[PDB]
Copies of this chain bind each other. A is one copy, B any other.
């Protein structure tokens, strides 16, 4: 929506002023403003806007005031502050050139979302549930990143670690919690929905959608119409399934050419992915997962709305 996107983006200048003491240390406060301005507001803001959409579809229609929708927008920006911190750090860790300037900037940007929460939410019933959610998601996200790191040793991928169980765990902890669960749980808490069973049923569907989302992203990295997962030796769905299907000779090709800088080695891996019928395997998985997720959304109870979860599902599958 034009109205939702514009109202959301209009909050950002306020967040910057809130976090930059708008003081005895103006030069470092001015620097932090530039850290936020470079790293937080550019690009799509899907997690932030999903927080507003979630609240709008969970809250009673009578309670949807401009004031409440703005609070949902502020929670959205706290998710985008978390996103920014993860993006700053991961790029240092993976020594990435581009995405789409100091080390402690990721700790600072992460820490800043709790100042925003304190400013706007400290007098509301949802305050402690929301801070505890952010605390738990950062802890779990770190466990995800560390599990991902345990698939690499001395710059070489550990292909024995490339199991579907470990992959599913990496996606859940590293990505799905903060990307899919966090926005919806935030929307629920702001709508004064605290029922554990409601959060649990939401979590189940969102982790399923999250897993397909990342598998699709992994697939498109190699087979989309420019991906470097193979070169970076990433624990990708393609690599995990390739090893499941591989005969000893196909396993040797992975062991020799996966996670190499030479463009020829990337091309060799893609050729093996084609030989192993990974495109067909993805098509089957996309159909099966869509039908299972559609079923689980139809089955959603505990007084949760289906349209929210269908909207999230549609955005990912694009049908």
Contacts and interface: CB of A to CB of B under 8 A. Distances in A.
Contacts of A28: 143, 146-147, 150
Contacts of A146: 28, 31-32, 101-102, 104-105, 108
B25 A147 contact: yes
Contact of A93 (B103, B111, B135): B103
Interface size range on A against B: 35 or more
A29 interface: yes
A149 interface: yes
A198 to B, nearest CB: 20
B128 A104 contact: no
B108 A107 contact: no
Contacts of A106: 103, 107
A135 B150 contact: no
A245 interface: no
Nearest to A108: B142
A254 to B, nearest CB: 22
Mostly, the A contact residues are helix
B145 A104 contact: yes
A150 B27 CA distance: 8
Nearest to A93: B103
Interface stretch (A114-122, A177-185, A210-218): A114-122
A107 B104 contact: no
Contacts of A105: 146
A110 interface: yes
Contacts of A194: none
Contacts of A32: 143, 146
Interface of A: 24-25, 27-29, 31-32, 85, 89, 92-93, 101-108, 110-112, 114-115, 118, 122, 127-128, 131-132, 135-136, 138-139, 142-143, 145-147, 149-150, 169, 173
Given A28-B147, A32-B143, A114-B139, 10 more contacts: A25-B173, A27-B147, A32-B146, A89-B103, A89-B107, A92-B103, A102-B146, A103-B103, A115-B136, A131-B131
